[PDB]
C-alpha cells in the first residue's frame, strides 16, 4: 500500500525479531535472538468516497485519518466549487489542510 493523502503516513522499514528462551523477569536465563530480518509496516490505507459539490471524490487515506476527510467536506461548504472537475475539487479540499 502507498501513502495517506491526508496525514502523509507512509510505509516504514521495521525489523522482525525472532526470540527464544525465557525472559529474565520470569526466572529465566534470558532471551536469545534467533533471527533479525527486515520487513515493512504499511499504513492502514482505505478508500473513502464522498460526494462533494455534486461530484464524487475518492481519498486513499489511513483509517486513523478517515474522519479528517469528512471534516474537509464541512470546511468546503464555504467554497465555490461547482463547475469543477473532481480532480480540481480534490485539489481544493487538500489545500484546506
Amino acid at each position: 500500500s502507498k501513502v495517506c493523502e491526508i496525514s502523509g503516513k507512509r510505509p516504514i522499514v521495521a525489523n522482525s525479531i525472532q526470540r527464544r528462551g525465557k525472559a529474565k523477569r520470569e526466572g529465566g536465563v534470558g532471551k536469545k535472538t534467533t533471527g533479525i530480518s527486515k520487513r515493512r509496516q504499511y499504513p492502514n490505507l482505505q478508500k473513502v468516497r464522498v460526494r462533494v459539490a455534486g461530484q464524487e471524490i475518492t481519498f486513499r487515506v489511513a483509517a486513523s485519518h478517515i474522519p479528517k476527510v469528512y471534516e474537509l467536506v464541512e470546511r468546503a461548504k464555504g467554497l465555490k466549487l461547482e463547475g469543477l472537475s473532481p480532480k480540481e475539487i480534490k485539489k481544493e479540499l487538500l489545500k484546506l489542510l
Partner: protein, 146 residues
C-alpha cells in the same frame, strides 16, 4: 459518534436531537442520505442558534397575541342592525364583526380565526371565542342592537 438528526428516526430520536451511533452507520447511511449531520462543534452552535431564534419567534407571536387579548376582552363591539323585537332581518357575520372592529376601535381582525358556525340572527349580547394563536383564546363580548 454523536450526530444531529435532520429527521425524526425510528428508535434513534426526534429531529434536532443529538444521538450517539456507530461511526459506520453514520458515514455509510445517515450522512449520505441526509438523515443527519455529525455533531461538530462548528454546527453544534448552529443548532443552539435556531433553537434560540425559534423559541424567540414563538414567544413574540405569543406577545402579539397577548396584545390583542388585553385589548379585545377589555371592550364591547356594538352592532346596530334592523330588527323586530328579536329576529334580525339580515345577519351579522364574521366579515361584519370584522369591518366593525376596525371602524370602531382601530383594530384589524381575521374573520376565519373567529368561532361562528351560523351567522348571527338574533338581537342580544354574545360572547364569541377568538383564536389568533392556539392556547391564547380571545373572548369577545358583542352587542347587536337596533
Amino acid at each position: 459518534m454523536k450526530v444531529i438528526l435532520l429527521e425524526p428516526l425510528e428508535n434513534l430520536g426526534d429531529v434536532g436531537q443529538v444521538v450517539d451511533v456507530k461511526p459506520g452507520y453514520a458515514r455509510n447511511y445517515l450522512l449520505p442520505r441526509g438523515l443527519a449531520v455529525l455533531a461538530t462543534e462548528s454546527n453544534l452552535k448552529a443548532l443552539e442558534a435556531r433553537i434560540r431564534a425559534q423559541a424567540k419567534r414563538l414567544a413574540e407571536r405569543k406577545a402579539e397575541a397577548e396584545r390583542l387579548k388585553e385589548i379585545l376582552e377589555n371592550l364591547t363591539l356594538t352592532i346596530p342592525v334592523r330588527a323586530g323585537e328579536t329576529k334580525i332581518y339580515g345577519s351579522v357575520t364574521a366579515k361584519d364583526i370584522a369591518e366593525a372592529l376596525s371602524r370602531q376601535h382601530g383594530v384589524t381582525i381575521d374573520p376565519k380565526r373567529l368561532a361562528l358556525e351560523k351567522p348571527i340572527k338574533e338581537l342580544g349580547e354574545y360572547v364569541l371565542t377568538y383564536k389568533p394563536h392556539p392556547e391564547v383564546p380571545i373572548q369577545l363580548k358583542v352587542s347587536v342592537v337596533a
